[PDB]
Amino acid sequence: RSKEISIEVEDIKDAGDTGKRLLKINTPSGARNIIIENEDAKALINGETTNTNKKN
Amino acid sequence: RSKEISIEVEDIKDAGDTGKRLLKINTPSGARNIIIENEDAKALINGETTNTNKKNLQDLLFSDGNVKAFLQATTTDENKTALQQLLVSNADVLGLLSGNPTSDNKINLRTM
């Protein structure tokens, strides 16, 4: 009868929507895409800014 | 096989690598260390920036190189010429600010 019963993210009944997205994410870039909504701030944190991002 | 299901993070089969690291983390600082890969951006968010972090953040924030030199408080004579042009529109006054006005600038500055 198995040994571990590896649950999945959606089995965690009091996890939040952003919380489940973060738990599923594999890389730091993916996490930043979830967490940072302001596109200019995200661009700064990614070290990749256009002239429009810089002005903003 | 059953007492209670006090599962652990690695029992969650479809959790991602970053997702499991975040679920295990205890503090906001730890979470920021996982999520933010750019060291200059992480330093800004932590409110703890070196002069190198500041210069690198200025590179992410501003496109104009003459403006960037001004913000670093280190300007060449070429940077100064360009910055003068952002600050003053009169061509004869720009001649004066250069320290080397042309003959025409000199005549016009006296008239002025």
CA-wise closest residue to B47 among B61, B25, B34, B32: B32
Q: What is the resolution of this structure in A?
A: 3.6
| Secondary structure tally for chain B: helices H, strands E | 8, 0
User: What per-residue string of b and e applies to B59-94 under the rule 16 or more CB within 10 Å gives b?
Assistant: bbbbeeebbbbbeeeebeeebbebbbeeeeeeebbb
SS3 per-residue string spanning B31-58: HHHHHCCCHHHHHHHCCCCCHHHHHHHH
Residue with tokens 């600082």: B29
d(CA B32, CA B82): 39
d(CA B37, CA B18): 12
Count of Cβ atoms closer than 10 Å to residue A46 Cβ:
19
Determined by cryo-EM
d(CA B22, CA B20): 5
Q: What residues of B are in contact with residue A7 (Cβ under 8 Å)?
A: 7, 11-13
CB B78 within 8 A of CB B64: no
Q: How far A27 CA lies from chain B's nearest CA (Å)?
A: 5
Q: What residues of B are in contact with residue A8 (Cβ under 8 Å)?
A: 12-15
Q: How far A25 CA lies from chain B's nearest CA (Å)?
A: 5
CB B92 within 8 A of CB B101: yes
CB B96 within 8 A of CB B105: yes
- Residue B96, Cα to own-chain centre: how many angstroms? 33
d(CA B19, CA B13): 11
